[PDB]
Amino acid sequence: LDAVRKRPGMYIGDTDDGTGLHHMVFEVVDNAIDEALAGHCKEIIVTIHADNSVSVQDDGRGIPTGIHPEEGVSAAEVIMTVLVGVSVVNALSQKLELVIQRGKIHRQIYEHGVPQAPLAVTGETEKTGTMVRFWPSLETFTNVTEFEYEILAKRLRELSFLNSGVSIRLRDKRDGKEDHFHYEGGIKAFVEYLNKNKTPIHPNIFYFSTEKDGIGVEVALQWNDGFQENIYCFTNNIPQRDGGTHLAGFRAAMTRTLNAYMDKEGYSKKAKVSATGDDAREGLIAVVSVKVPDPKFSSQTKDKLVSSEVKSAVEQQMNELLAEYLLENPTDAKIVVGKIIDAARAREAARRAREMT
Numbered sequence: 001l002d003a004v005r006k007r008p009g010m011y012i013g014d015t016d017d018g019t020g021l022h023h024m025v026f027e028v029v030d031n032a033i034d035e036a037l038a039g040h041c042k043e044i045i046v047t048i049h050a051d052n053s054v055s056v057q058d059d060g061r062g063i064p065t066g067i068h069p070e071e072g073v074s075a076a077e078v079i080m081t082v083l084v085g086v087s088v089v090n091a092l093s094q095k096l097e098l099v100i101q102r103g104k105i106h107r108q109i110y111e112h113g114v115p116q117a118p119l120a121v122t123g124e125t126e127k128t129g130t131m132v133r134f135w136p137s138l139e140t141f142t143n144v145t146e147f148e149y150e151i152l153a154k155r156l157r158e159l160s161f162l163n164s165g166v167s168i169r170l171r172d173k174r175d176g177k178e179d180h181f182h183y184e185g186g187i188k189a190f191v192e193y194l195n196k197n198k199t200p201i202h203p204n205i206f207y208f209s210t211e212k213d214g215i216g217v218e219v220a221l222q223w224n225d226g227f228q229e230n231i232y233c234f235t236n237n238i239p240q241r242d243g244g245t246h247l248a249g250f251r252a253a254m255t256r257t258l259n260a261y262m263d264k265e266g267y268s269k270k271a272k273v274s275a276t277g278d279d280a281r282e283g284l285i286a287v288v289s290v291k292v293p294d295p296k297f298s299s300q301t302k303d304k305l306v307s308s309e310v311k312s313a314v315e316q317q318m319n320e321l322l323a324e325y326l327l328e329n330p331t332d333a334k335i336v337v338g339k340i341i342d343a344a345r346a347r348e349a350a351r352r353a354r355e356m357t
């Protein structure tokens with residue numbers, strides 16, 4: 001905990017540009033999401049309070065009050081004081097308020113990670129769940145010290161997309177602003193949301209969710225009438241801004257599958273054109289979400305995945321299931337290939353124009 005306060009940037013992220021400050025919120029929220037994955041938390045409420053603090057309330061089982069025999073303290077204190085983990089959020093807060101409903105209300109206060117008293121019973125209750133409220137230390141965080149609604153909203157919405165049926169509410173008490181995120185459609189609903197202001201060219205969103213060689217692979221995609229590529233890549237719900245081996249495998253499987261379809265069904269022959277990866281990527285919206293037990297990144301930022309085995313897992317699953325999708329949905333296949341041929345014709349005609357005088 002003293003080591004965390006000494007080098008706060010290492011554990012929570014950049015402590016000056018706002019990255020670290022908002023990651024304090026996301027770490028506490030991630031604990032509530034793990035309970036929702038376990039099947040107990042149905043709703044999470046995140047509130048930005050007027051005094052520049054944030055609270056997160058879940059309706060799960062509540063953190064164990066049962067006391068540790070070796071440590072001699074409540075199991076909730078062990079989670080809050082021992083090593084991202086919630087102890088990091090606790091170490092870098094000037095104050096943190098813990099409230100556990102489990103059928104008794106338990107309360108504890110911390111200051112700079114150190115508890116004022118043990119976890120004591122305050123009253124009685126029928127409900128269940130955990131509440132954590134924290135005041136981030138202004139010794140640690142500089143420049144950007146105030147929480148920003150839109151930064152918390154963007155990530156909690158994607159966390160809803162990424163975690164099947166988890167209700168997340170966001171409340172800003174400074175100005176009354178509210179949001180409720182609860183997308184039951186999941187990453188398929190992510191793609192719908194990403195294409196809501198675009199024009200989708202075919203009705204059936206491609207989707208699968210599989211597990212091979214200890215790697216979870218989940219993909220959704222859909223083409224629009226535009227010419228932009230917009231792939232969003234995730235590893236254990238952490239976004240990779242700069243892609244990596246998940247994105248490579250996705251791209252590899254996709255060029256291979258569509259070319260194989262266009263060759264076999266006789267599209268390439270009739271057109272007299274050879275389609276490339278760039279032709280297929282135009283108008284594409286996609287989300288690639290992988291589950292890796294021990295993932296390797298390029299740096300501590302996790303902007304790029306470098307686990308080489310993830311490429312093969314994504315590539316192989318994509319090849320099989322995208323090929324199944326094309327045959328089973330021939331009208332979608334015909335629209336998408338029609339767009340790809342026209343992009344290939346335009347590119348090849350443009351390349352032919354430069355050389356010809």
Ligand SMILES: O=C(O)CNC(=O)c1ccc(NC(=O)c2cc(Br)c(Br)[nH]2)cc1
Binds near residue numbers: 028035061
């Ligand atoms: O110890 C056992 O054997 C069983 N324990 C559990 O099942 C168990 C149940 C709940 C939690 N914590 C949370 O849901 C949580 C943390 C924060 Br921060 C927020 Br908000 N919610 C942790 C362990």
